[PDB]
Amino acid sequence: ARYLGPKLKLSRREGTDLFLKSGVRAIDTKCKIEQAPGQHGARKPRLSDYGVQLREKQKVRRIYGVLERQFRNYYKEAARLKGNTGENLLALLEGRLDNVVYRMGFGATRAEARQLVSHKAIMVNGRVVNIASYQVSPNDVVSIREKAKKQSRVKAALELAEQREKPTWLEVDAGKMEGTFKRKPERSDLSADINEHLIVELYSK
Amino acid sequence: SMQDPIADMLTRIRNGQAANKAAVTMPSSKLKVAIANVLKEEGFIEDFKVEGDTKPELELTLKYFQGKAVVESIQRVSRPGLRIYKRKDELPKVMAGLGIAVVSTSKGVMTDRAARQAGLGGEIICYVA
Amino acid sequence: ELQEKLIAVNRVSKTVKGGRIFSFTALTVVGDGNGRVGFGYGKAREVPAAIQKAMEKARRNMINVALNNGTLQHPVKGVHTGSRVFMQPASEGTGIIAGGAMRAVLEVAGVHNVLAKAYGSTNPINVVRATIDGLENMNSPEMVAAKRGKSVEEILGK
Amino acid sequence: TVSMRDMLKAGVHFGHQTRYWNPKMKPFIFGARNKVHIINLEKTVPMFNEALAELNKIASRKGKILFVGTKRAASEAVKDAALSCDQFFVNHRWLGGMLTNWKTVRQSIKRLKDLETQSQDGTFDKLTKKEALMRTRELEKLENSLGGIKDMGGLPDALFVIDADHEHIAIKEANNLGIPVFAIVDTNSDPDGVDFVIPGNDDAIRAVTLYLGAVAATVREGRSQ
RNA sequence: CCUGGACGAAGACUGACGCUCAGGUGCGAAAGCGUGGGGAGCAAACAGGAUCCUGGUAGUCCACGCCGUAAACGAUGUCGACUUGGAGGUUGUGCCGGCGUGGCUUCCGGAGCUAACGCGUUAAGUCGACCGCCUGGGGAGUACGGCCGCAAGGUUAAAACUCAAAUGAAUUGACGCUCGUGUUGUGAAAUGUUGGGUUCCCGCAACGAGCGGUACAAACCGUAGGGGAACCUGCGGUUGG
RNA sequence: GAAGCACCGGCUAACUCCGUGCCAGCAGCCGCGGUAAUACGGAGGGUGCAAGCGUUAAUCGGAAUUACUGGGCGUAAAGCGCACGCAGGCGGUUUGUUAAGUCAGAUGUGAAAUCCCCGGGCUCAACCUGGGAACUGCAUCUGAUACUGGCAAGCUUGAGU
Ligand SMILES: [Mg+2]
Ligand SMILES: [Mg+2]
Ligand SMILES: [Mg+2]
Ligand SMILES: [Mg+2]
Ligand SMILES: [Mg+2]
Ligand SMILES: [Mg+2]
Ligand SMILES: [Mg+2]
Ligand SMILES: [Mg+2]
Ligand SMILES: [Mg+2]
Ligand SMILES: [Mg+2]
Ligand SMILES: [Mg+2]
Ligand SMILES: [Mg+2]
Ligand SMILES: [Mg+2]
Ligand SMILES: [Mg+2]
Ligand SMILES: [Mg+2]
Ligand SMILES: [Mg+2]
Ligand SMILES: [Mg+2]
Ligand SMILES: [Mg+2]
Ligand SMILES: [Mg+2]
Ligand SMILES: [Mg+2]
Ligand SMILES: [Mg+2]
Ligand SMILES: [Mg+2]
Ligand SMILES: [Mg+2]
Ligand SMILES: [Mg+2]
Ligand SMILES: [Mg+2]
Ligand SMILES: [Mg+2]
Ligand SMILES: [Mg+2]
Ligand SMILES: [Mg+2]
Ligand SMILES: [Mg+2]
Ligand SMILES: [Mg+2]
Ligand SMILES: [Mg+2]
Ligand SMILES: [Mg+2]
Ligand SMILES: [Mg+2]
Ligand SMILES: [Mg+2]
Ligand SMILES: [Mg+2]
Ligand SMILES: [Mg+2]
Ligand SMILES: [Mg+2]
Ligand SMILES: [Mg+2]
Ligand SMILES: [Mg+2]
Ligand SMILES: [Mg+2]
Ligand SMILES: [Mg+2]
Ligand SMILES: [Mg+2]
Ligand SMILES: [Mg+2]
Ligand SMILES: [Mg+2]
Ligand SMILES: [Mg+2]
Ligand SMILES: [Mg+2]
Ligand SMILES: [Mg+2]
Ligand SMILES: [Mg+2]
Ligand SMILES: [Mg+2]
Ligand SMILES: [Mg+2]
Ligand SMILES: [Mg+2]
Ligand SMILES: [Mg+2]
Ligand SMILES: [Mg+2]
Ligand SMILES: [Mg+2]
Ligand SMILES: [Mg+2]
Ligand SMILES: [Mg+2]
Ligand SMILES: [Mg+2]
Ligand SMILES: [Mg+2]
Ligand SMILES: [Mg+2]
Ligand SMILES: [Mg+2]
Ligand SMILES: [Mg+2]
Ligand SMILES: [Mg+2]
Ligand SMILES: [Mg+2]
Ligand SMILES: [Mg+2]
Ligand SMILES: [Mg+2]
Ligand SMILES: [Mg+2]
Ligand SMILES: [Mg+2]
Ligand SMILES: [Mg+2]
Ligand SMILES: [Mg+2]
Ligand SMILES: [Mg+2]
Ligand SMILES: [Mg+2]
Ligand SMILES: [Mg+2]
Ligand SMILES: [Mg+2]
Ligand SMILES: [Mg+2]
Ligand SMILES: [Mg+2]
Ligand SMILES: [Mg+2]
Ligand SMILES: [Mg+2]
Ligand SMILES: [Mg+2]
Ligand SMILES: [Mg+2]
Ligand SMILES: [Mg+2]
Ligand SMILES: [Mg+2]
Ligand SMILES: [Mg+2]
């Protein structure tokens, strides 16, 4: 139900940095990010309209660690909701509990944050939630339970979050190891390079 | 045999408009004048004149804006073979409101826009755009 | 400055007494994304040569299309020799939902949200011509307010 | 700018036979006598004066005017009136692609300037039984064809055409580039191809001079300032 | 001798009495059949002579009955209205050979239409009314059943199975040479380099440059017959030669 | 104590080597194999999914490919050989009321569940659930009557004498 293979292979195939590692080292220092994985990765072949759409869909899935069945349900909910389909799709993805943990800087990586959630170390509104896909509503306070405040993973992840750009739709309190989900992020609040209309067109077909 | 005079009225308009005609003349009738009045109010034509009593003939003045026909698409929707009646909430919007739909309501002949304001359905005489 | 896309490449052939002579034909579409789009049909013997010819033809012979913030003013029907093309304005966030040939034309023209369908023959050169024909005859609310004697308020607000 | 009676003397009212009549020219025909259409001189004067007024406006703002005349009489007539207004002309056969193939036409001009240079300044003094005579034949043919556009070096801002039906090729090239077209449209021509239509007879030699004289003088008047 | 339809001029008169039509009814080339005549020429079959020719039966003709099929075609159902124009034929009629006004008809051609060809006021343009008919090729308009017929057969009309094509139009070739640009065509492509004269000139949608019948990738339709049948013949029709 | 399956000629995301040599085989279509096969079998690598993954069957979609919305009939399949004509379909132009079609409003009904909207409860989801909307319908009543039809007079352009 997860991907347990090499992380940098996914980033190399997509050509960009998927933030699958904590970022202590530069991405090019650990792999040839400009070259695709495999024997024939040095060559750069053509890519059709379906290829770029599939690559964009695989990009966001591998960013948030979501398989196809779970991701497809997100598209149906996004297309069912009011307003923009692509913006809702990113908002639904960004609202995942593990994503909120990673964005608030409790886990160095979303995969690490996924493990933190699964091991019953994340308390949402005083309630232990270990479901990675569990959605976080605005004005909800997530926190590290006192039993998990002795782990060095939480302490180390705070420094990495400080170096990274701090989201404007979230509130972080590293002293208390708790955060507040202020609001749903907008399209501008996220990375512009990600394309959502390609995903919408791909899932329409 | 001429089994639809209303469609013939539209055909004369469409043929004359495409042939860069100055005016189109046709036999007149009570319904034709009502239709021609609606077109003039919306500005799809300039003016209509009715001449004669024993054998009335309707005269229509066509409109050209910039070397081009103003009436680009005039279509007979309801026909004697297949009558078309729509309710107020089913009234079509031609070109998302840019065009008009001549609707025969119980209070007379008007456009689809007026019919929605008056809350009246009826027979869709033609589409004008 | 303006976006350009290659749609189709085909290998054509002619017969001479010596033998068969081959060539490559490339269909491209260009546009600025702000309501201007043109299509070009290059014809050479080498594929890189043909695509450059198509871009040169497409760069000129452009048309101007009114766009309502990335969508069509009203649903329209584009018709060419064999292809029937139906295009329809869509809400914000729907994206370009059209065929392979139609999608390229609408992207370079600046159309972002649109519902489109192709009927009849789907030959790429005929489809793009119908799409170009279907967009050039589309009239903005100002244009219909110009032909008729009413202002924009009377056309739509009334 | 020309009285109706004067145009009658010039033969502007005269037209072709009704057998070859163009239906598009119906509004511009007064009638038909002796199986010959008569051009309504009343319509011509306001159209010609407005066409002349537009020529004054575009010349004064430093445009460029090209004259196209290939008729037997009009060929020489246009050239005499062309230099008076200091504008460009095409007396001989209009070569297909003069406007469309401007890049190719430019190379023909570049050939001509080098060709005249050797015979005027270069002083080649080389015959070889082949080179000199062929170059002179090249010079004489190039001068007849592109002699009137040597000083232009660019796309003409507007065109003046005689016998628009005979010069349809030039009109088609101008319509592709958006260049306004002025033409003397006879009864058998196509008026839809011209922007400013001048319903006059293009076959009468005296009429052509009246057209050219009234046009060339206005260009000088507009360019005088 | 009897009789139908059409058209024109000028009125009178009736006052929507109209249009289209499933079933139905009648009509319906040639061939073929029934009954009785007729039979010159021509001529399936047949007989004989040759490597087509001679002879000649049905049939072709007539009266009546049947058959109801054709490439029965303009491969375009009928009715109505509207929409640029030229040339001609054929019949009216009005006015002073001219000058208009009708009906039918032939060619050319604009917009428009069409995949192209092409159609183009007699539309395959623009609309309306109604009817008929089609939705892969072959099997097959065949089998079975019904109906009709003296028979030939006609009409209505499948399925199994098989193939992934069959087909239309147009193009390029077969049976000194190219490019660039431009132009025509949806396109393949053409123009250039299609013509006249003598490599050259001129004309020229080209301008310049670099170089040296095909079912290919007479035919057919309906019908009738064959014992010198590698298919052929009689009759009428079609050009899809 | 816990990762497999299919695919990598095009359509269709992902390629090399080896063996084989129109053999063995592959195959939804186009089609691959007779000596360098990215199409066979194996390996390496890669891609697509994932406690599933392929294949087969069936329906719908794509198929505007039975086209009501939304197709055709000169030559691609398609105008009956032609005509008359019953039933049928449709029908010029004025008034008068008829209010059947149609139109507007009201009333009754259209079971619950389901679908959709807004919330709620299961740590999330599936699932469960509150309230709506919808249920495109039918019937009765009251109106409007421009159009269509019925009825009664006409009118003359259609059609006829
Ligand atoms: Mg699962
Ligand atoms: Mg949405
Ligand atoms: Mg869909
Ligand atoms: Mg209709
Ligand atoms: Mg092909
Ligand atoms: Mg198709
Ligand atoms: Mg095809
Ligand atoms: Mg193709
Ligand atoms: Mg008689
Ligand atoms: Mg009477
Ligand atoms: Mg009377
Ligand atoms: Mg019948
Ligand atoms: Mg008979
Ligand atoms: Mg008979
Ligand atoms: Mg007989
Ligand atoms: Mg007999
Ligand atoms: Mg006998
Ligand atoms: Mg005999
Ligand atoms: Mg003997
Ligand atoms: Mg014989
Ligand atoms: Mg005999
Ligand atoms: Mg004999
Ligand atoms: Mg015999
Ligand atoms: Mg006998
Ligand atoms: Mg019979
Ligand atoms: Mg038949
Ligand atoms: Mg015939
Ligand atoms: Mg037939
Ligand atoms: Mg007609
Ligand atoms: Mg023709
Ligand atoms: Mg057709
Ligand atoms: Mg079949
Ligand atoms: Mg049979
Ligand atoms: Mg019987
Ligand atoms: Mg029997
Ligand atoms: Mg039988
Ligand atoms: Mg039978
Ligand atoms: Mg062609
Ligand atoms: Mg072209
Ligand atoms: Mg064409
Ligand atoms: Mg032939
Ligand atoms: Mg036969
Ligand atoms: Mg014969
Ligand atoms: Mg015949
Ligand atoms: Mg055929
Ligand atoms: Mg690929
Ligand atoms: Mg080997
Ligand atoms: Mg090998
Ligand atoms: Mg191979
Ligand atoms: Mg495969
Ligand atoms: Mg293999
Ligand atoms: Mg592997
Ligand atoms: Mg794998
Ligand atoms: Mg399981
Ligand atoms: Mg299916
Ligand atoms: Mg369907
Ligand atoms: Mg239909
Ligand atoms: Mg069809
Ligand atoms: Mg056929
Ligand atoms: Mg027929
Ligand atoms: Mg039939
Ligand atoms: Mg029959
Ligand atoms: Mg039949
Ligand atoms: Mg009849
Ligand atoms: Mg009847
Ligand atoms: Mg009736
Ligand atoms: Mg009526
Ligand atoms: Mg009434
Ligand atoms: Mg009622
Ligand atoms: Mg009532
Ligand atoms: Mg009601
Ligand atoms: Mg209710
Ligand atoms: Mg549903
Ligand atoms: Mg709950
Ligand atoms: Mg909940
Ligand atoms: Mg519920
Ligand atoms: Mg409830
Ligand atoms: Mg309710
Ligand atoms: Mg219910
Ligand atoms: Mg009332
Ligand atoms: Mg009534
Ligand atoms: Mg009534």
DSSP letters spanning D64-131: -EEEE--SHHHHHHHHHHHHHTT-EEE-SPPPTTTTTTHHHHHHHHHHHHHHHHIIIII-----TTTH
Continuous segment of H or E residues that includes residue C100? helix C100-109
SS3 B24: strand
In a domain, D20, yes or no: no
Task: Give the residue carrying structure tokens 């004008």.
Answer: B128
B127 touches chain C (CB under 8 A): no
Please tell me whether residues C78 and C41 are part of one structural domain. no
Please tell me whether residues C95 and C71 are part of one structural domain. yes
Q: How far is the CA of A146 from the centre of ligand 76 (A)?
A: 41
In a domain, D21, yes or no: no
Residue D219: C-alpha distances to residues D80, D82, D212 (Å): 15, 10, 11
Q: Which of D111, D146, D181 is the last residue of a domain?
A: D146
Which amino acid is it at D189? S
Instruction: Provide the chain C residues 80-139 that lie in CB contact (below 8 A) with chain B.
Output: 89, 137, 139
Furthest C-alpha separation in chain B: 42
Distance CA B3, CA B79 (A): 10
Query: Which residue range(s) make up the domain with C50?
Result: 3-59
SS3 A131: coil
Dihedral (Cα; C89, C92, C96, C97), 10-degree rounding = -70
Which amino acid is it at A145? R
Please tell me whether residues B62 and B2 are part of one structural domain. yes
The residue among B10, A204, B94, B7 whose CA lies nearest residue C77 is B94
Query: The domain that contains C11 carries what CATH number?
Result: 3.30.160.20
Please tell me whether residues C33 and C71 are part of one structural domain. no
The CA distance from C75 to the nearest CA of chain A, in Å, is 20
Query: Which residue range(s) make up the domain with D109?
Result: 95-146
Residue C121: C-alpha distances to residues C99, C126, D23 (Å): 12, 8, 38
DSSP D136-151: HHHHHHHHHHHGGGTT
DSSP, res B59: E
Q: Which CATH number does A7-92+190-204 carry? A: 1.10.1050.10
Task: Give the residue carrying structure tokens 């050239």.
Answer: D79
User: Which distant-in-sequence residues (6+ apart) come within 8 Å of B36 by Cβ?
Assistant: B9, B45, B48, B58, B60
Tokens of D197: 């239509």
Q: How far is the CA of B64 from the centre of ligand 34 (A)?
A: 70
Please tell me whether residues C69 and C55 are part of one structural domain. no
Distance CA D177, CA D197 (A): 18
Nearest residue of C to residue A187, measured between CA atoms: C93
Distance CA B100, CA B108 (A): 16
Residues of D128-146 as b/e, b for ≥16 C-beta within 10 angstroms?
eeeeeeebeeebeebeebb
DSSP C12-65: EEEE-SS-EEEEEEEEEEEE-SSSEEEEEEEEESSHHHHHHHHHHHHHSS-EE-
DSSP, res A185: -
In a domain, D38, yes or no: yes
Please tell me whether residues D217 and D179 are part of one structural domain. yes
Distance CA C42, CA D164 (A): 32
The residue among D120, D202, D213, D138 whose CA lies nearest residue D165 is D202
Pick the CATH number of A93-187 from 3.10.290.10, 3.40.47.40, 3.30.200.20, 3.60.10.10: 3.10.290.10
User: Which distant-in-sequence residues (6+ apart) come within 8 Å of C31 by Cβ?
Assistant: C2, C3, C4, C37, C38, C62, C108, C109, C110
DSSP, res A14: H
Continuous segment of H or E residues that includes residue C116? strand C114-120
Tokens of D111: 């050939």
Task: Give the residue carrying structure tokens 């497409």.
Answer: C58
The residue among B19, B3, B101, B121 whose CA lies nearest residue B62 is B19
The residue among B84, B87, B92, B128 whose CA lies nearest residue B112 is B92
Beta bridge partners of C79: C84
Q: Do A83 and C93 touch (CB under 8 A)?
A: yes
- In chain B, beta strands by DSSP E: 23-27, 48-51, 57-61, 74-76, 85-86, 100-105, 108-111, 122-128
Dihedral (Cα; C67, C69, C75, C81), 10-degree rounding = 40
Chain E nucleotides reached by a protein CB under 7 Å = 18-19, 79-87, 99, 110-111, 114-116, 125-130, 171-174, 178-190, 201-209, 217
Beta bridge partners of D39: D29
Distance CA D219, CA D60 (A): 8
Residue C81: C-alpha distances to residues C103, C123, C126, C130 (Å): 19, 10, 7, 8
**What sections of chain A are H helices per DSSP?**
7-14, 27-30, 49-64, 68-80, 85-94, 97-104, 110-118, 152-163, 197-204
Distance CA A70, CA C61 (A): 48
Residue D92: C-alpha distances to residues B20, B126, D1, D77 (Å): 37, 57, 29, 12
Furthest C-alpha separation in chain D: 64
Tokens of D50: 């407005």
Distance CA A142, CA A198 (A): 33
Nucleotide with smallest C1' distance to residue A73 CA: F125
The residue among A180, A174, A178, A130 whose CA lies nearest residue A155 is A174
Chains contacting C with at least 3 CB pairs below 8 Å?
A: A, B
Distance CA A63, CA B94 (A): 46
Do the Cβ atoms of B42 and C150 come closer than 8 Å?
Answer: yes
Tokens of D121: 């300044």
Query: Which residue range(s) make up the domain with B96?
Result: 72-129
